[PDB]
Structures are given as C-alpha cells and as structure tokens.
Amino acid sequence: SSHTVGPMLAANAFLQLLEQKNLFDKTQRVKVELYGSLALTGKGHGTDKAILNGLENKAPESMIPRMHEILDSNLLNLAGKKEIPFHEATDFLFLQKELLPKHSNGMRFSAFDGNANLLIEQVYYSIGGGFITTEEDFDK
Ligand SMILES: [Mg+2]
C-alpha cells in the first residue's frame, strides 16, 4: 500500500545495513517487530508476507506460497544467499498494543549471532504510501 511496499523496502534496507556494517556473515537469526497500524493489520494480511519476501531480497518494483514455505521449513533465505532458522513465534511479532514514538507505522528489525547476542537493531517507519525512513532520518 504501503502496508506492503514500505515494509518490503525497509526489509531491503535492513539487508543492505547488514552488509554496510559487515554483520551479514555473523547473522544467524533475525527478528521483526511491528507496531501501531502495521501490527493491527494481523497475521496473513500483507505486511508479514511483504517483509519476509523483502528479507530474501525481493523488491517492490508468489509472495504468499513463499511465506508458507518459510514458515513450513523454518528457513529464511537471508538476502539471497544464506538460509537461517526462522520461527514465526519468536521472530515475527505483531505488537498491536504498542506504538513507536515518531509514527504509527513503525517496525524494528534485529539481527543476532549464533550465541544469542544482538548484533544490530534498526527502526524504520513506512510513511506513505511507500517511502521509508530510519528513526534517525525521520525529522529531516
Ligand atoms: Mg515450520
């Protein structure tokens, strides 16, 4: 909308951040948290498929079967590239009762190594329809 386009672009951006930071090779787990209006959409209403496909390097410019295969296999093909365990129950959260502060359409991406250590987290907002911004760039 973007409850699909912006979320997908944020996933693409997160992937590029992992490369820019040389944290991709260390990443063994990712977690996505949805807030406000994105969270209120709920499971299987676009935003989840948009993000999971975007974390596999699909760009807005098939999505629902592929979501199904990621959930069935518990493997996310990160960036192309590298298969990691993925468990929806712990790794993809719809936080319908919370808001990030700049805006309703908030999302947080996190990458962990194999020892449970947080490597990086990044907040993006989908700001409509279809642009994204980091938390840090929001006010500019
Ligand atoms: Mg499964």
CB under 5 Å of ion ligand 1: residues = 72, 74
- CATH architecture, domain 1-140: 2-Layer Sandwich (3.30)
User: How determined?
Assistant: X-ray
Q: Record the resolution, in angstroms.
A: 2.0
Cβ atoms 54, 10 nearer than 8 A: yes
Q: How far is the CA of 88 from the centre of ligand 1 (A)?
A: 9
* Cα–Cα dist 89/130, whole Å: 27
Radius of gyration of the chain (CA): 14
Q: 108 - beta bridge partners?
A: 33, 123
Describe the crossing of helices 63-73 and 47-54 by its angle, rounded to 10 degrees.
70
Q: 85 - beta bridge partners?
A: 75
- Domain ranges within the chain, ordered by starting residue: 1-140
Q: How far is the CA of 133 from the centre of ligand 1 (A)?
A: 32
DSSP code per residue over the chain: --SSHHHHHHHHHHHHHHHHTT-TTT--EEEEEEEHHHHHT-TTSSHHHHHHHHTTT-----HHHHHHHHHHHTEEEETTTEEEE--HHHHEEEETT---SS-SSEEEEEEE-TTS-EEEEEEEEE-SSS-EEETTTTT-
Q: How far is the CA of 119 from the centre of ligand 1 (A)?
A: 25
45's tokens: 């209403």
- Length of the chain as a residue count: 140
* Cα–Cα dist 122/74, whole Å: 23
Three-state SS string over 53-88 comes to HHCCCCCCCCHHHHHHHHHHHCEEEECCCEEEECCH
Cβ atoms 128, 6 nearer than 8 A: yes
